[PDB]
Every structure is written in C-alpha cells, then in structure tokens.
Design an enzyme around this catalytic site. Sequence first.
Site, mmCIF file in Angstrom:
data_model
loop_
_atom_site.group_PDB
_atom_site.id
_atom_site.type_symbol
_atom_site.label_atom_id
_atom_site.label_comp_id
_atom_site.label_asym_id
_atom_site.label_seq_id
_atom_site.Cartn_x
_atom_site.Cartn_y
_atom_site.Cartn_z
ATOM 1 N N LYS A 68 0.871 -1.115 0.000
ATOM 2 C CA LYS A 68 0.000 0.000 0.000
ATOM 3 C C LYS A 68 0.906 1.160 0.000
ATOM 4 N N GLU A 101 0.524 4.998 14.401
ATOM 5 C CA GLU A 101 1.345 4.040 13.753
ATOM 6 C C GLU A 101 2.027 3.275 14.762
ATOM 7 N N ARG A 102 2.315 2.027 14.411
ATOM 8 C CA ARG A 102 3.063 1.211 15.273
ATOM 9 C C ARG A 102 4.388 1.612 14.948
#
Lengths: 466, 467, 66, 487, 58
Positions: free
Chosen positions: A154, A180-181
């Site tokens: 993506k 976000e991780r």
Amino acid sequence: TTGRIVAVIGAVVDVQFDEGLPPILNALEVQGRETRLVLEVAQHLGESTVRTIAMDGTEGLVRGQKVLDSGAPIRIPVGPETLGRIMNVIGEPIDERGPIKTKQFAAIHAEAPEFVEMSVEQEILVTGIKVVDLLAPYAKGGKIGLFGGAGVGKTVLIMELINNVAKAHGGYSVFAGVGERTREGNDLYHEMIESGVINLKDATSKVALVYGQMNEPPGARARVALTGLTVAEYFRDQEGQDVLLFIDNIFRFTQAGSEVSALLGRIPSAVGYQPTLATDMGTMQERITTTKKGSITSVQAIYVPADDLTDPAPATTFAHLDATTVLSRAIAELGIYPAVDPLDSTSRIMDPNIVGSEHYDVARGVQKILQDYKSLQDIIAILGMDELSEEDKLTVSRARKIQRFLSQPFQVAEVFTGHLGKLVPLKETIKGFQQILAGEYDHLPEQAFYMVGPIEEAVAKADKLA
Amino acid sequence: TTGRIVAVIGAVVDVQFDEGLPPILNALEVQGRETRLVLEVAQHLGESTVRTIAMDGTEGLVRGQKVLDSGAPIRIPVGPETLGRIMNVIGEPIDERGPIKTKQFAAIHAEAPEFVEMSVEQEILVTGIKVVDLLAPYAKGGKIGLFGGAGVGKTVLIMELINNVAKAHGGYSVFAGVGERTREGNDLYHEMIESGVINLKDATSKVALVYGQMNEPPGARARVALTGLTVAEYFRDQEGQDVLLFIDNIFRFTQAGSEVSALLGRIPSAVGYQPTLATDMGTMQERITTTKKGSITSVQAIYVPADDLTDPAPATTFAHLDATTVLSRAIAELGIYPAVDPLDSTSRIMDPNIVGSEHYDVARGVQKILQDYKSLQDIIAILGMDELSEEDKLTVSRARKIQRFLSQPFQVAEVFTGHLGKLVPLKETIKGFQQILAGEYDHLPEQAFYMVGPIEEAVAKADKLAE
Amino acid sequence: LDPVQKLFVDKIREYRTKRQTSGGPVDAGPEYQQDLDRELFKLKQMYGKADMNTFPNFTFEDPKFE
Amino acid sequence: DLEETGRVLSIGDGIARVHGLRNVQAEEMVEFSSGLKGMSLNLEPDNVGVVVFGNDKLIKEGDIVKRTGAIVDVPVGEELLGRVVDALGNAIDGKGPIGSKARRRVGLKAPGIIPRISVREPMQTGIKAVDSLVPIGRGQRELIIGDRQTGKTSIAIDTIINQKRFNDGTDEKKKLYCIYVAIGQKRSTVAQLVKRLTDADAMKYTIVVSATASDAAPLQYLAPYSGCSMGEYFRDNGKHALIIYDDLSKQAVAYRQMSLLLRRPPGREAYPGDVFYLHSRLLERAAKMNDAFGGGSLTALPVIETQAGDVSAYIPTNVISITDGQIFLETELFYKGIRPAINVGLSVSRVGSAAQTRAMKQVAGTMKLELAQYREVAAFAQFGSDLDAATQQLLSRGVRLTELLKQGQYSPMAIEEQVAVIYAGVRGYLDKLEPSKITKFENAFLSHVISQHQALLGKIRTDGKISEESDAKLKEIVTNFLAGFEA
Amino acid sequence: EVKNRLDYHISVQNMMRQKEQEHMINWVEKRVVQSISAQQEKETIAKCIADLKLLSKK
C-alpha cells in the site's frame, strides 16, 4: 512565568500558573522535565489555573512542580531539511541525527485559507497511474482517502506515487504517522530508506516523517494532525508547494480526539464521538486545500471505522473526501498490482458535469464493460465463453486487456516485480483505452497488456509475441 | 408583589420575589416587558426565589428586572365569544378582531373531574369512514389519539375527520393547533372563513381556534393545551357541548415539556423524556373527559417522532386513550391514503353489543384475516409466495381489496388525490366486508377497491376496471 | 485624536519621501522584489503565456478547392 | 469605563462565564475584547453564559468582555444581492464592505396567519421535474434531502441560475432574492459554488451567507437565522425571497455540540430537541405573506443531506413534519447517471397546485400520474416479469418520460420549453423512438422552436397555457421536427 | 486577448501597493511608537475629554 502542578490526574494536568494567563494552546514546558513535557493549555479554568493536557507522560510530579510557559503553541522547525527526518510530533527527531535543523519555525496551528486566498476552482492532480488518473483523478489540494489492502505494498504504492508525482511535479511529502506502530513506522522507515525516497544522505529524502504514534499521549497524536499540516503549509506557501500529505491513519487521530473529549470532561457524543467532531475536522480540513500558494494535497490513510461508517466520523469525512480510494484485494488477487477497484476509485468531484465524462464515460464505457463483463462473468462463470455473442467475447477480452493494461510495473518494487516500474501519461493511457475500446487491439495478446507502462508498451509487448 | 429577574437562563426565568413567594401557578407579569411577559411560577426555589417559566421571549432583560406578580395564572376570557376567534395561549386574540369579550375568566389549569363527575359509560360515536369505524368504532366524547408521523396526509387525515365528521357533528368545537405549522393553520383558518365554519358574523362559527405554534417558546407550547382544555370544559360543562378538541399536536406539548426538564434542573429522563411525563400528561388527559355534562371528544394528534411507540411517550398515551388511530408509515408508503396501521387502530369499545355483533364479528373476522394475512406477509416476504394455501392466496388478494377498499380517495384533497373521497354508511361497510368475505368480488381484479367509498361502488368500480 | 494626529502626520511624510525615491522599496529591500517574482510567475499562467505588454498578432484561415 | 465592561469570569471551551455587566439585556449580543462576538444567552447571577462566536485560543482568562449592549441584529439591505458574507454580515466575499447599513433583528418572529397569506405564487427552478412534480410556489418550506454531490448542491444552483431570467425578467412580484445559507461547506466548496454563481452572476440578486466547514459552531448555528433575517427583509419589502438552508443538519450538529458544551443534555438521538424549536421557529419565518408584507414570501428550501436515508431519523422526521414537502433525491439513479436522481415517490409538495399553470396541468396531470403508474409498473411490471402490452407501453413511454425529466447538471430551463417537450412526450410522441435520442431530439427541437417557433413559444409563455392550435402547431413542429429527427 | 495583458499590470501594482502599504505601516509604527512619556498630554487630553465624559456623558 511558572506554573505549578496543582492537579495531576493522569495526563490531565491542571496547572495553575501562578502568574500566567497564556491563551489556550499556548505550549507549556514543564520545568524539571528533562524530557520535554509539553502541556498544552486546554481551558482557562479560572484561578490562574488552566487545564492542560500533558502531551508527554506523567511521572515524578511534584506538587506544584514547576512549569514554564512556552507561551504560544509549539514552535517547531519548518524548513526543507526535515525531508529526511523523522520527528515525533514535537518536532524532535526520532530519526535522531541530532535535531532537525531549520530556523524557520512555526507554532503548530495554522489556519484555513480563506476566500480571498482561494484558487477557486480546483485542479486534478495527475499521477500518471492509469488507475488513479482514470478512476479517481486526484485533485491537487484534495483529500483522498485510502481504504486499502494491508501490507500489500500500500505504502509502496504510495511511495510509487510520491515517486511519480512528487518527483514529477516538484511536490514534497509529509508523512504523519498517526496511530502508527513503531513497527509500522519502522516498516516505512526502511521502506523509504530502501526505496531511497528517504535518503539519509540526500535531499532525495523527499519526505519528512512526523510521527504521532499510539504510544504517545493522546494530545500528541491528536495534535500531530495540526503539526503535519503546519509543515506542509511551510512547504506550500514557502516552498510554493503542492504537498503530498500523508496522514495515516487519520482515524486514530480522530479517536484520540474523542478520547480526550471524555477526558476533557466533555461529553464527546454518542458513538463516543467528540461533538465537535466535525469542527475539529472542518478546521483541520480547511487548512488543507488549494490556494494561491500551491496545494496541500492529502493522501490520507483512512480506516473504515469498525467497518462501519454510520458512526458519524467517516460520514463527515465523506465531505472531506473528494476523491476516494479503496485499494482492492480483488484486483490484487487477480495478481494485479495495481490492485485498485475502479468502482471505488471515484471522486465526489468525479461526476461528468463536475469534472468530466471523458473520464466519466470513457470510464463508464470501461466500467460498464468490466462490470458488464462482470455480469457476463457470472454468466460465463456458468457457461464458458462459447455461448456469448462475439462482441461480448471481444468485450471480455478487451475488458481484460484494459484490466491488464492497468497492471503496471513498479520501479519501487523491482524486488516484488522484478521490473522497473512504469508510468503512463494520461492522454496516452486513455488513448490506449480508446484503442482497446475501439477493439483495435483485440487481435493481440491480451496479456501483453499485462504489466506495462504506456499502452504502447502493451502494444509493443503484444508484438514480440505476435 | 415585585420580583427581580435574578437569572434568566433561557425562558426559565428565575425570579426572586422578595415580596414573599406566593404560590406556584402564580402568573407573573414582567414589568418593563414590551410583551406582557407571563411567567408561570413553577418552583419556589427557596430563598425568595422561584423558578418560573417564560412562555414568551426573553428580551431586553436586565437581570434584576421587575416583575410584578399578577399572582394567579393567566386569566383569559372564556366562553362563547372565542368561537370563531383565533386565540393565542395567553387567551388573547390573534383573530385580529381585537378582544374576546366572554367574561368568565380562567386560569388555564383546571383539574381532573371526580369519579362521580365522569359520564360513566360512553357509547359509540361514528364517522362513517370504513376504515375508521371499522377499526376504531368511534366513541362519543372519547379522546382519540392519532399516532402519526409527520403530516404526510396525516394532517390531511385529521382534517378529513374534521371535514366529514366535525362537520357532521353540529355542535361546537375547539381546535388547538399546538406547535401548529402556522402556514396550515392559516389555510385552515381561511378555510373556515371560506366554508363559513368560521364566519366573522357569528360565534356560531363552530370552532374556536386556539393556536400555540412552533415559533413559540415551549412555555407557550406546553400550556396552550391547558388553555384549550379550559375552554372546552367551559363548553362541556357550562354549555353541554360535545366539544371536539383538535389538538395538533400533543406531542409538541410534550416535547415542550421534555425540553425544559433539563433546564428545570431536572433529569430529562428516558429518551430525554422528563420524569414527570406521566403525571403532566396523565392529569391533563384526565382533565379531558365526557363528564356528566357533556363530551370533550378529543382528537388528539400524536406525533410520534420516528413513530416509535415503544417509546415511552406513546406508551403512556395509550393509557388515556379511547380510540387510537395509529397511522402506519408502512401502509402509507404504499401511497395509501388512508395511512393507518389497521390492527393497531382500534377502539376499545369493540363489542358484539355496542358495535353489535354484526360489526363486531365481521370485524373480528376481518381483523382476524388481516391479522392472519399479516402472518402471511412475513411468510411470502421470505418464501416468495406461490405454494401457499390458495385460500391464503385468495385472502391475500382479498385483504388487499379490503385494504384498498379501506382506502378512500380524499374528499377535500382532490388537490392531493384528484378524486373526491367518500363516506360509507356503516352498514354498507359491515356488509361490505361481509361481501368481500362472501367472495362476491373475488373472481375479479383487485384493482378497483382502491380509493373507494361504499362497497357496491367498489364493485361498480370493479366493472369499469373489468375492462 | 490630536495628540494622535501627531502620529498620523509621521506616516504621511514617509510615504512621499519613498514615492519620490525608492531603495528597493524604501523600507523593504530585495525581500519585497523576491516575493513578487514568486507571485508574478503563477499569474502568467492565470493570464495567458505572452503578449502581456505587446499587442497580440493574429493569423487567418484556409480552404480546399473542390 | 468599566462602565461598559466586564472580565471573563472563566473561559474554557469557548464558554465564557462572564463576569459583571449585570445591566445586560436578554439576548444581548456582546462583544468580547478580541473583536469576537458572543451572545449572552444565559444570565446566571454571577456570570453570563456567553456563547463565543469564534475561539478562545484568541482569548485568555479574565478577558474583558465588553457589552455591545445590542440584541442581535444583522446588517440588512439589498446590496448583499451582490455579496457573500459571513454570518456577522461582513464581506467574506471581501469585495468591499456591505452596502447594508440597515440592521435588522435576527430574532424577528414568524408573523401570524393574518400577517400572512397563502401561496398562489409559483416558483420555478427550470428543473422540469421540480416545477412540475413538486410544483412549488413561494413561502413554502420544502425539504431537499439528498446526498454527496448528487448535484445535491447542484440542484440549488440550477434553480438559482434559473431565476436569473426572472431577475432578468419582470416578475418583481415574483422577484426571488436568493439566499443560500451555506452551512458546513468548506471554503473550497463554497469557492466552487460561489464561483459558479459569479459566472452566472446570479449574485446580483443573491446573498450567500457562508459558514464553512471550519467555523465556530455558534456561527454556523447562527448563520441561518441571519440569512433568515436578511431574507425576511426582502420578503417584507414585498419581495419574494428564496432561502436555501443548507444545511441545518450540520447546524444541528453544531448546536448540539453547543448544547452539550453548555452541558445541557439532549434527548432522542442524543439530540436535544429544541433544535426543532430552533428550526421550527427559523423556518416558521419561511412564509408567504399577505399584502402588508408586499405579499412577500420567503420560500424556504431547506436542505438536509441524507445519509443512510433514515428519514426515520428524528431530525428528518422533524423536518418533514415541518415542511410543506420534500424532495427526496435517489442516489442510485444518480449512479445510473440520473440527475435529477429523485424519488418523487419520496418527494411531495402537499401544496403543489398554488404554483401551477394549466399549461403545466395540461401536460403534468397526465404525466405525474403516468409516472406514478409507470413507476408502478416500473416497480411491479417487467424487469424479469410479464409482458402485457399496456404496461409494456407504459414502460416504454414511461422510460421515455423518465429521460425526459432527466436533466443535466447545469441545465435550468424556461418553463414553456419544458411544458413543450413534456407535452411531446405526454402525447406519446416518442414511443416510436428509443430513449437516448429523445435527448438529442429535444436539444435540437428546442433550438429549432426557439428559433422559429419562438413565436409559438412566446405565445405559449404568454397565455401560460397551451392552446389547441398551438398544440397543433407544436404538434406539427414536433412531428415534423421529429420527422427531421429521424429523417 | 487585449484585456489579458492590461489587467495583470493593474493587479500587480494593486497587490504591490498593499505589500508596500502593510510593510511600511508595520515598520513605521514599530519604529515610531515612542513618546508617550515624552508627551504625557495625550493622556492629559484623555483626562480633558475624559472630564468632558465624566461631566459630559450624562
């Protein structure tokens, strides 16, 4: 001025500034807070006490611990040297190559462009990607929302987009890693490193990464939105830019808004939602636009919240969406990278009277053809091909060529593709489809339309075969 | 006494009268108020303060402003001269023919008639509308509720009752447009002039108009009901009269109530609905009656927002009801005007006695079949249709005929219908169903029954359609 | 006011001195000029592409002898 | 000169508890220090609950809130017909300043029955479907309910555009001053829109009150009331005002939020209900006036943007119950490419007729009906069903009629054309033709008749009523035209 | 095509004059805003007119 911890209940710190009345959103730095414990003034409670929101964690909080008002919102470096720097929200690196080294700073709220500032009727941003341009032709300044296949590349696609455009037109990028991780930011990190779209030795680090991840206090994540904007505005106005602004996933930002809402003692609303949900958004969105300064063009990863939308936020978002991306597994499943679905790659501004039927109808013909073909696909699914009219057979093949023609190699993923990528100039693309549509090549290898750049290269690709 | 505006927090005007605190229900007149600004005392809040309600706007108020307690509720002229006059809540004209001059004056509250004061048993009134009578066989002097959504022909319908029936009953009426959508109230008005149902020549204009619109504060909207009631009560008790009491819409009263509750510092309880939903309503509804001195036949519009009835409000409502006219959106949407949910639209006075058994049974048979049919809808919905008992098939169609037959074109709203609407003398109706039941029609197309009056004619209509 | 017209005078004086001179803009330096150039480019696209100070020439058309 | 001021007792949440000034008028618009306005809604003893129009990042505690001493008014005047303003009535157009140096109370009541009069006025939109099928006069509250640029917005635009001819006309008695109160539509959105209007320069007879997406909620809230006041003026200057309230849904949010921020709880759908009062009162001011008001009208086309079509939703129900009809628009049709995307089974003008001409009646009676039936047979008959000729016809024809009301976005029209083409179809002049080519036919036809039979058209306009001769002339014109359309 | 040439020059001079006007204004005002203690009597005229308020309001 100094303030005192008067109350700490979690990351809501009510600080009595014992001598200050700095307006709300004035950034406070807590003294004795080695780590930049920004409190954002939230309410003026009276009593020279403000409700602040700690935006850094709470610890060691001496009662009356001393706080020194920074007196305006966070001022942050703004300057091109950020492209190639991952900062946290606070604009501190987290790329850790000492600080980031602008001089031009900005207080992290920026305001909407106004009427007089406008550039009244928008403009398509073009990527040169067949799918994009065709189906949801982007608007410069536009906020486009990414529903989309996870881990499918993506991001990669996005990199490719950056590549295609931000290179092409001299756009730059800001990435706001919202929710976000660390892991995912990492993923990106190397992806960018690897890709060399972040270049930690070159200014072909075209992206400043700003991160406003989960692990932060809400305020930070919440505010990372304003922040990210603030940078891009810097690039926009200053660097004249048409910015690509990745805010990914804005949804979690939103969540954060709501999270605090409660904890701002406020009623959020039903479904949890801060009742201001829209205004928060509105105000945010309205900063993001097209003007006489360039465009801040927004590529927004957008989660389908709870895979529902009833939930007001996306519903609102729809307004805030203008060109829509659902990145699609089916397509992917067909091995097609691009993996986008056309019937979703749409734009509310994609309307014929409102953009144009060249897209809309050539597409309608196409979308017709594919879907119609889908209608046949069920038929065929039973019957085979034989039974159909030949015209249908043709159309199937064409649809399929077209389809295949959407398969487009990647420069940024020779690792996946084993190919260079491609780009497709829109006229040529379309023309391409006119050809296939015209049936012109339907006596050619359909699978030569597979993974190519120009429709010519699909044609070329057909030839070597037959 | 004088009070000072101490807080106006909205139209809750918090007044402190230092000059005692005379009871609740004291009407206060705000001094220095351009509009004679009635406050109704609600709470003696304690310490020389009362919480009051402005029913009027809250303008120009300087917190302190003197209110001179008028010391009793709004007193309004009551009695016959109001007939043909358009009144506001504050029992003051909007006829725009100046004062009304019927010198019995009133506090707009009145309290429920004692047990003995009730006319003990009421007896069926009728209307002649098949659907209506059939399902709700009218009660003399009852309170009839129109559950109903958003004036879709609802309003038309209520009118329609008024037209056929309110006309049909000769004696005086009260129309209370509460929250009324003034535009239609205009129309209605103009119509009453037009019809000569209002005549500016007589108060034999069979209707006194009371309007307490939706551009009004809640305080007004809440209270206009009481007002209307007080008046009709005049006619009932004093003037005998089956006052026909049109309330459109009680909901807005209620609504007005719920909205304030919060502001009343109360909890605006379930669904936001006030705690006291019952008592206010109940007591109010209980004011309405057919006493031993007459009838207030009340056709009470009940907006049911999103038509939920499970919804406490309607849930309550039922308690007071006598005939429920349940409008069915489901039906309506089929274009049907009538809109009713039939097997909800009822009158308790379903009787082999009162309605006589003929109706009763026929109806019960009907009710049954429809109910049965109802069962089938579900079935066909999911099972298509087509393999059922064919008797069911027949009924299904029949039911539709019946339905259709229950449908009537509009007699006033040729504007809506392009038809005139009709009326069906009750026996032709009972007979009607008996006939359909008799299958007399049922070897026919289904079409004709739609928008019909008398069943024979539906047959007539069949013929023209049998072509 | 009139002790505030004492300030108003001050400004009027500076306006003429500049106008009958210039130093960049008198009070502005290159910075003004640079900003303009950034706006001036984009406006060309909004306004056309050439002829901005010089009258447009035109050309004329043809046919097929049949 | 603390003798016109107070200090912000507490501020947080744009919620100003305001200390002092107990001299305050109920409903006073006050001004805070910052040029920011607020309104003193709540007179608490020890504070004034003052709604902040704008923001308090632009403020700090204790700030002086100074009386403006004024009850809310809006600048009012007609030069605004030729302006886009913010809610405060300030040129967000930025053109110059408002010409409006009249002010008018925004809180003016909706007048009475007697201070009003019913409709007999017609009003046009150039949208065939509209003027016909929900034929609308003026005063009328009509809910536009509809979705993401379905032309949802467009719809209003073409309508406005249509009035251009009228504003170019002499129908002053019908001169429709248009107010598009834009609630929640971002600056960009507006930018496009406004621009379009500019181009159409309908703007000369137009206010656009714009509280964009961004806004401080009270502004957004206020804006319609504002628009309303301004329009009431026009109405009351005899004129016929058209207010498009766009959209109170968003307003509702804003308000709700406001209420909630006021800590004031809500009811049903979490929604506090006096938004109904709000709007009701707002919309009650939409009316058709008697003669005293110069016969005025303020026709209200409120917009509520459906989402999910849950009309079931309280707020739609509300609005329906207020309105004098709705134009429900159906998106599916839109995907089908159909603008107008209407479902006029779900659109009604319970009025209708006050706005109508026999010309129109003469074609429309039949058509509306035909469409009803057509729709009905669209709905039951053939789609994978039966093949009775009657109904099949109805469908063919119907289908035809469908296209015929199908109207491009950016396509308002003159009524006579419309009656004309419609007439054509009504009278079945196209069953013998396949649907697409109708469209072609119409354009061509139209330009033809415009050209020659402008005579006839002229006349048709003039009498307002097609006439038998004309019918023939028309017929001929069409038949022949049609004949031309083929051959 | 004739208009297109002209209006650009007008528009540039207009915007240019505003970007002079603002820039001179802030610079002049930000330089000269000092002499209030040198001439007190801008507050003496405040107290003069303010006495003709403190008298002449009512």
